[PDB]
């Protein structure tokens, strides 16, 4: 399914992404428009063999299995199709344990080039929450 801007931000927020680790609402709606394009059915293969899943992208080496990764690890314990559902709930459950990780947001290279230190509040700006 493709989000609505506003759509994701609540969805987000219910989920309780707003401020976890310290992270805005804005910083993970910015993350999503440019991972996916709010797309939850978003795909990309790496030169490494490994493929990205869903809304943010997750990747098949460490966080989810997809079958056809050698030696990846499935460390949200998951298979990847999981992450392309329009249920955002496990796509959000195994961001939290990325964020968790030592680097912060820092792991989605779109948020890092694009979002981190831009207004991200913008993202939400006119939506009811």
């Given amino acids: 399914k ?3 801007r506003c759509e994701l931000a609540a969805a987000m927020k219910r989920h309780g992404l707003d401020n976890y680790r310290g992270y805005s609402l804005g910083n993970w709606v910015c993350a999503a428009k ?6 939850t059915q978003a ?8 493929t990205d899943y869903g809304i943010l992208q997750i990747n098949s080496r460490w966080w989810c299995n997809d079958g056809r990764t050698p030696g990846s690890r499935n460390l949200c314990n998951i298979p990847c199709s999981a992450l392309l559902s329009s ?3 496990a796509s959000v459950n195994c961001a939290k344990k990325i964020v968790s990780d030592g680097n912060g947001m820092n792991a989605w290279v779109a948020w890092r080039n694009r979002c981190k ?11 009811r929450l």
Avoid: L, P, Y
């Fill in 117 to 127: 230190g831009t207004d991200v509040q913008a993202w939400i700006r006119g939506c």
């Fill in 34 to 39: 440019f991972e996916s394009n709010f797309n």
């Fill in 2 to 4: 493709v989000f609505g």
């Fill in 43 to 50: 795909t990309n293969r790496n030169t490494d063999g490994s």
């Fill in 87 to 89: 249920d955002i709930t």
